[PDB]
Amino acid sequence: SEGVTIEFKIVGLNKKLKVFTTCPHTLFGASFCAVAIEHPIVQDLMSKEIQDLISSQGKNNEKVGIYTGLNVKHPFLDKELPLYVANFVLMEYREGAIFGCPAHDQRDFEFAQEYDLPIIPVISSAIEEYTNNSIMFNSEFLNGLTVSEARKVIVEKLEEKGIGKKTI
Ligand SMILES: [C]N([C][C][C]OC1=C2C(=C(Br)[C]=[C]1)[C]([C][N])O[B@]21O[C]2[C]([C]OP([O])([O])=O)O[C](N3[C]=NC4=C([N])N=[C]N=C43)[C]2O1)[C]C1=[C][C]=[C][C]=[C]1
């Protein structure tokens, strides 16, 4: 609709992953990264046998994915996030790649529950016509800020480091 594009460093390689989000302020609650089945990164960084795993389609309506074997470095935390090929990510929409926040997104929770991924809460429950007064927590420099202030500060920090930009 109107979001931000974020670059993630792929661990042990000189390659990057661009993801699109409409909730950049929930970045400290990221558990995984997921790309579409038809994403270029599948043909570039993975074996041809990945198509055999993909066709095994079996669990429809259920959020399923395959761990690629690669991790991405979190931009602000000393930690890595696993990278998946997921059935619920659409290639034709934006970058065909997402970051997952299971504590505040139903689709991300269903995926994390299946693959035992961590659940990290970041919003404590209370464009310019209204202000969302829910407060950020577990989010380093975003702590204590309302959701509205946090959306602004995270974008300034991503732009300041050359790893994020506004995307219409
Ligand atoms: C879940 N819904 C959206 C609802 C709003 O998205 C939410 C998003 C977060 C949170 Br926290 C809460 C809601 C965070 C963490 N996941 O990021 B979020 O913002 C993006 C958000 C942007 O979509 P929109 O419609 O709001 O403009 O959808 C996710 N996304 C992006 N590209 C994607 C892609 N190719 N295939 C799938 N999903 C993608 C991203 O998920 C996904 C959805 C289902 C089908 C087509 C397109 C989007």
Author numbering: 221 to 276, 280 to 349, 353, 378 to 418
What's written in the study?
Cmpd9 has stronger affinity than Cmpd6, which arises from a more favorable binding entropy, likely due to a more optimal conformation by the alkyl-phenyl group of Cmpd9 to bind into the Wolbachia LeuRS drug pocket. Specifically, the amino-methyl phenyl of Cmpd9 packs between residues F311, L313, and Y316, and makes several hydrophobic contacts, and at the same time, the phenyl group makes two favorable aromatic π-π interactions, one parallel-displaced with the adenosine ring and one T-shape stacking with Y316. This conformation is further stabilized by hydrogen bonds of the adenosine-phosphate to residues Y316 and S221. Other key interactions, shared by the two compounds, are a hydrogen bond by the oxaborole oxygen-1 to T241; and the three hydrogen bonds established by the 3-aminomethyl to F322, D328, and D331. Conversely, the B factors of the adduct AMP-Cmpd9 are invariably low for all atoms, including the phenyl group.
Altogether, these experiments show that benzoxaborole inhibitors of Wolbachia LeuRS are prodrugs that, in an enzyme-independent manner, form adducts with adenosine substrates. The adducts then bind with potent nanomolar affinity into the Wolbachia LeuRS editing site and efficiently compete with the physiological substrate norvaline.
